């Protein structure tokens, strides 16, 4: 019987700073035990300082990004070139995803950018449109490997102040763009080591008030 | 998930956990399961995340349209029925929702309606909904009285979620507290189970099963 879904593997990662936000994702595309491409980008600049990735089944991922990009275009036409805020984009994407509630887009979507106060914002979606703003989110095949590491390093979970008898927690603080990229790179090298669907290349999109910058890093190709 | 809301002398207490799961994978510990429909109406969320989140924000739009058209805030009965009539149209399609519409109006007073995805709609004083509902019931029922103070009621609702958060594997994260009065709903903070458990264990002397 024809199965309309497939798994294209790969993994994505979004972290939000004080005045910036990053959305990273490996460039490997696979089916079963075969590599389709070592460089197939799945993190996209959608305009209005919104970066987006829809990881999982690449066909549904591409279709969703394509539709959101088009949604941004028509938002400009219908509302006098108004800038689509990240919160408004998130709600719009929920309706896109839930629109196909009974034949879902098989993707974990993450968007990143700046909120209306100029602060870093990451939003994550499930396949059918439930969404939530977070400081931190990993999605895709190696999400289960990366996410607990992020809980520990970004949100300082299970880390107590030394000598305080486990009474005082390690205080939360915003990370610099330099420190965030270190965590992204270490997250992806670790995921590459222990996950077969993750590797080849790492592409990071950084979003500040100035615009959208890109950075690329090699990953192990085995 | 674990959600409860009960009616008492001083209005309505509403309490929920904040965990979201995909099988045995803990997906999130910081989910908002209470929807703020308006200053006098609340809605709780259990079951499918998307179904609850999507249709209860939609419910809020329908309640807004009601007060524009009728120049009057929608009743808790009417609001719950819009939701129950909606999910009933989708009956058999596979929606998964266990919700509670809680609020105050002049004509009704404090009112709680249980509404779920197979079309059940029930008015009542006490309800617990979710995978950890039975754990919350155990603590809530054994300590519930109508004459509870606002302080004691808030604690019991918090303590009942904590009990479920502890025993139920698919509940936890943090407790969100709400109190609904004649003047509207009042938020009573987010309480992380990580700190709350030990705080409760020490001060109350309960949870002796756990290695202190």
């Amino acid at each position: 019987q024809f199965n309309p879904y497939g798994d294209n593997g790969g993994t994505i990662l979004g972290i939000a700073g004080e005045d910036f936000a990053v959305l990273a994702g490996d460039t490997r595309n696979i089916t079963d035990y075969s590599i389709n491409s070592r460089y197939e980008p799945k993190v996209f600049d959608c305009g209005d300082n919104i970066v987006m990735s829809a990881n999982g089944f690449a066909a549904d991922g591409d279709a969703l990004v394509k539709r959101f990009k088009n949604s941004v275009k028509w938002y400009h036409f219908d509302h006098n070139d108004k800038k689509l805020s990240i919160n408004s984009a998130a709600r719009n994407i929920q309706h896109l995803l839930y629109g196909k509630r009974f034949f879902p887009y098989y993707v974990h979507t993450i968007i990143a950018g700046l909120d209306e106060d100029g602060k870093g914002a990451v939003y994550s979606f499930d396949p059918v449109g439930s969404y939530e703003r977070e400081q931190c989110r990993a999605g895709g095949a190696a999400a289960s490997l990366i996410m607990p590491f992020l809980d520990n390093q970004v949100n300082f979970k299970n880390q107590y102040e030394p000598g305080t008898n486990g009474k005082v927690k390690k205080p939360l603080k915003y990370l610099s763009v330099e420190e965030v990229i270190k965590l992204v790179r270490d997250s992806f090298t670790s995921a590459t080591e222990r996950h077969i669907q993750v590797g080849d290349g790492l592409e990071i999109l950084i979003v500040t008030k100035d615009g959208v910058r890109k950075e690329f890093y090699e990953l192990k190709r085995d | 998930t674990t959600t409860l809301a009960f009616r008492f002398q001083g209005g309505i207490i509403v309490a929920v956990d904040s965990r979201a799961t995909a099988g045995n994978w803990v997906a999130s510990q910081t989910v908002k399961k209470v929807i703020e429909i308006n200053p006098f109406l609340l809605g709780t969320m259990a079951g499918c995340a998307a179904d609850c989140q999507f249709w209860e924000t939609w419910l809020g739009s329908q309640c807004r349209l009601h007060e524009l058209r009728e120049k009057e805030r929608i009743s808790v009965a009417a609001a719950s029925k819009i939701l129950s009539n909606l999910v009933y149209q989708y009956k058999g399609a596979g929606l998964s929702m266990g919700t509670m519409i809680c609020g105050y109006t002049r004509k009704e007073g404090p009112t709680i309606y249980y509404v779920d995805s197979d079309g059940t709609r029930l008015k009542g004083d006490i309800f617990c909904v979710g995978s950890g509902q039975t754990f919350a019931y155990g603590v809530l029922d054994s300590n519930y009285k109508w004459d509870l103070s606002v302080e004691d009621a808030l604690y019991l609702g918090k303590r009942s979620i904590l009990a479920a958060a502890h025993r139920d594997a698919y509940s936890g994260g943090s407790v969100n507290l709400y109190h609904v009065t004649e003047d509207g709903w009042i938020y009573h903070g987010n309480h992380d189970v990580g700190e709350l458990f030990w705080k409760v264990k020490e001060e109350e002397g309960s949870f002796n099963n756990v290695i202190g």
Binding site: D126 | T21, G23, C48
Partner: peptide, 4 residues
């Protein structure tokens, strides 16, 4: 399946 879904996310609960």
């Amino acid at each position: 399946x879904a996310l609960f």
